[PDB]
From TrEMBL:
Binding site for Ca(2+) 2: Q180, E185, D404
Annotated protein name in UniProt: Glycoside hydrolase
Keyword annotations: Calcium, Hydrolase, Metal-binding
Residues reported in the UniProt entry to bind Ca(2+) 1: E78, I82, V84, E91
Species assigned in the record: Bacillus pumilus (strain SAFR-032)
One Gene Ontology molecular-function label: cellulase activity
Amino acid sequence: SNKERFLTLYHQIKSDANGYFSPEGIPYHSIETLICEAPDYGHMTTSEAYSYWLWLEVLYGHYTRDWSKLEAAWDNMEKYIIPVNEDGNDEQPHMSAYNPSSPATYASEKPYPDQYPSQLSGARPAGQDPIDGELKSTYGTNETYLMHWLLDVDNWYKYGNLLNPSHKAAYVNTFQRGQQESVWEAIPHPSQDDKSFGKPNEGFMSLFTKENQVPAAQWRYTNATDADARAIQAIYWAKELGYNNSTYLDKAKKMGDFLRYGMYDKYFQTIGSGKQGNPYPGNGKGACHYLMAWYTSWGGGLGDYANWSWRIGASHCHQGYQNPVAAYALSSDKGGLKPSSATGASDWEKTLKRQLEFYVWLQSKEGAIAGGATNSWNGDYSAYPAGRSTFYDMAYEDAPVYHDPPSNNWFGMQAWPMERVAELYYIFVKDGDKTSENVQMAKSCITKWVNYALDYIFIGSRPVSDEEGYFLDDQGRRILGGTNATVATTSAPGEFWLPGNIAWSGQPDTWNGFQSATGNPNLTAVTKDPTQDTGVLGSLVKAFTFFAAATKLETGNYTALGVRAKDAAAQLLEVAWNYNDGVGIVTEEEREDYDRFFKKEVYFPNGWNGTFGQGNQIPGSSTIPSDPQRGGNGVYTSFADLRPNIKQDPAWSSLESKYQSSFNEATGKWENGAPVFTYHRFWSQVDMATAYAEYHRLINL
Ligand SMILES: OC[C@H]1O[C@@H](O[C@H]2[C@H](O)[C@@H](O)[C@H](O[C@H]3[C@H](O)[C@@H](O)[C@H](O[C@H]4[C@H](O)[C@@H](O)[C@H](O[C@H]5[C@H](O)[C@@H](O)[C@H](O[C@H]6[C@H](O)[C@@H](O)[C@H](O)O[C@@H]6CO)O[C@@H]5CO)O[C@@H]4CO)O[C@@H]3CO)O[C@@H]2CO)[C@H](O)[C@@H](O)[C@@H]1O
Ligand SMILES: OC[C@H]1O[C@@H](O[C@H]2[C@H](O)[C@@H](O)[C@H](O)O[C@@H]2CO)[C@H](O)[C@@H](O)[C@@H]1O
Ligand SMILES: [Ca+2]
Ligand code: NA
Ligand code: NA
Ligand code: NA
Ligand code: NA
Ligand code: NA
Ligand code: NA
Ligand code: NA
Ligand code: NA
Ligand code: NA
Ligand code: NA
Ligand code: NA
Ligand code: NA
Ligand code: NA
Ligand code: NA
Ligand code: NA
């Protein structure tokens, strides 16, 4: 019974015996502590994880008719990770002094962390913020009602929580230094920097920016646009399933209103204005790209002498972060979450359309979704390369925001968004729309994607791959993208396999609208690296489930592809159940990347010394000079030296001895096998739980 499987996993996730949550009721990234992938420690948590918790409680609340758990989850989010604390210290002091005519001061991004700190030069005057005034008039405040992306839930970095000292969970930041700063190469620092850690008199600021003076003490937060959007997607469903408490519905509306900051160029530069390398400030909504960019960030002074604040949007947009179910919820009567601001719903209505166009634009010749686009080439408004394809005057990028690893390689970035487009096809059809350009785009995209993905899903069979991760056909040749991929397969009862990554080449054609789409014959996805990721399985299932269900609502029966998607869904759910260990549905994974715990690649500028949260001097003596080819002049320490408390982790020992016995520092290769782990990730187990739930709701009933 899929309903019983849902309830079982729900209770495994929620059980105080299992450790998915902290003593303060806050979900962790994972049960295990020793893990690094986007958070850099398993008992961090993310806005991601909160949004998934919400999704979990909505479906539970549906089945039990008790919405208390959803409300408690929202309350917990508000208390610990949204930096608005009406009835306590102000967690955004001096936000009121924000200047919407000069939202922030320009600085260039750099191609390597070695080139930071970047000068706050104001070379490009920032454009007008056109939504500040609406937000103030609507809510009586400009305090940002969005989740900060990263919380140190056990205070493992030891910074404490300055503006709320009785909370153990402290707001922390990592990424700050451009597209080559992997998770391994960032330096964790407190969002609220009173300069009591970091370099004396400077805190951590001077790693990242230079200005004429010593940096003032200051605070800053950064959301992740897909997380707040998923929170809103969850509440969409809650309301569809009967939830009707306007106290919480209104909070989702407010979150959606502030999420519009995700639609603006970093420095409010006119969209397209940097095509030839000479950007200029936006007027009205001229800096609105109507997509969800990677983040919005906001900051200001700490203390009585620092009466200023600032906001940035972002210029880089990744397909994988778009959420058109949230956009629909926020923009129509049937969606039900339209904000009360003058243009919130209408901005989201445009976004819904632009998101769908972006997916169609980015879809490869064989059906996979390519990375995205930017309004700030190289992150400094460089002129677009000759011949570069564009989308609304923004340049195509195969790896938006991050290159280490390239951000659209992971197959999870296919499942996540296509799950939502599937949902949206279903939503549109259920709402009586078979004819709009929006439904035709959503349908066309998901239909082609489903066809695409089914070539690489194996249940009870094991695909044949080579040593470099390529899938092989029955004649033993590499399968290098293309439609009608026929992967060689040996019998393997009880196993499942999914693709792990895509290797991208080429470009889409420049966008001219849906009626002119070319099918992008020059954009290729090579799908690779079979693996057993149970988070991705859960997301795929839902994609296939909602797609199947939509086809039946549309036509009266499962279509040809709809049948195949339903059957794949059912089969994946059936095999996955065997991998429940009593705590979650899990598999073992090799982590060849875990040499990066030990590699000296964490950059510090010359002349900078200070104290890390854990008490250690940084960069300290365990360093090598930075690579002169990366354009800096400083040093590298390692991830592990930076975080000496990691050596107290129970798993550290085995990792270190595995490194010592298997990794060859000379060749950069694991010679006697790579480290191996079985992780219980919060989001992954939610994606599996909700998969059983929705198959029950949409297909069984
Ligand atoms: O005139 C009044 C006073 O002015 C003071 O000077 C101010 C100045 O006015 C103001 O403009 C300036 O503002 C800059 C900040 O100092 C600086 O910290 C800020 O840097 C941004 C940076 O531009 C941006 O790239 C960065 O993005 C990070 C982000 O923080 C991080 O969370 C995110 O992580 C994502 C992961 O990549 C992803 O895997 C995961 O899912 O989600 C994460 C979240 O999305 O990654 C990105 C990079 O990709 O954020 C930082 C801020 O943290 O830039 C501001 C504008 O340039 O500050 C000055 C003070 O220093 C004077 O000092 C005073 O004399 C005057 O009175
Ligand atoms: O940033 C995307 C996403 O990454 C998740 O970890 C992935 C990682 O990207 C992938 O290469 C690895 O092999 O599998 C893991 C687990 O599915 C991470 O768990 C998320 O927090 C993050 O948003
Ligand atoms: Ca790097
Ligand atoms: Na709060
Ligand atoms: Na801990
Ligand atoms: Na407190
Ligand atoms: Na606490
Ligand atoms: Na990363
Ligand atoms: Na600064
Ligand atoms: Na994210
Ligand atoms: Na109420
Ligand atoms: Na409100
Ligand atoms: Na709409
Ligand atoms: Na398409
Ligand atoms: Na196909
Ligand atoms: Na294989
Ligand atoms: Na195109
Ligand atoms: Na992995």
